């Protein structure tokens with residue numbers, strides 16, 4: 001499935017080149033510009049655990065998820081991964097726990113040492 005494919009066929013987008021965040025571009029977005037630090041970014045996403053559970057979806061809420069990029073308001077993999085996206089892009093991200101919730105996890109949804117899959121659509125970004 002898609003998690004296996006990004007695991008086996010994704011590109012390492014980390015600075016460290018530690019394979020901690022892998023990406024596949026599913027739909028090419030517009031132009032060349034990616035968001036900047038501090039931009040208000042609007043996304044739709046779905047997240048899955050490595051056991052196959054869908055732990056969340058913004059689509060199911062009928063509202064985008066909004067955050068300020070590069071401020072640690074989201075897991076590290078998101079700050080790194082969304083920073084690579086163009087407006088209108090859809091990507092898949094595979095997030096090792098060191099770039100997600102680590103050994104702590106996050107109750108109730110996220111176990112310790114969890115590798116996470118996300119599908120993310122960058123809707124818009126604005127200063």
Ligand SMILES: COc1cc2c(c(OC)c1)[C@@H]1[C@H]3CCC[C@@H](C(=O)N1CC2)N3C(=O)C(=O)c1cc(OC)c(OC)c(OC)c1
Nearest residue numbers: 045047055056057065073074075076078106107108109110
């Ligand atoms: C405690 O409730 C939430 C916490 C967080 C988030 C969240 O989003 C609805 C809810 C977000 C989301 C989206 C950006 C990436 C990632 C993330 O880093 N954040 C910020 C942490 N993240 C998730 O891993 C996520 O989907 C999620 C969903 C959750 O519930 C649907 C959740 O627990 C309530 C949770 O706890 C850490 C995380």
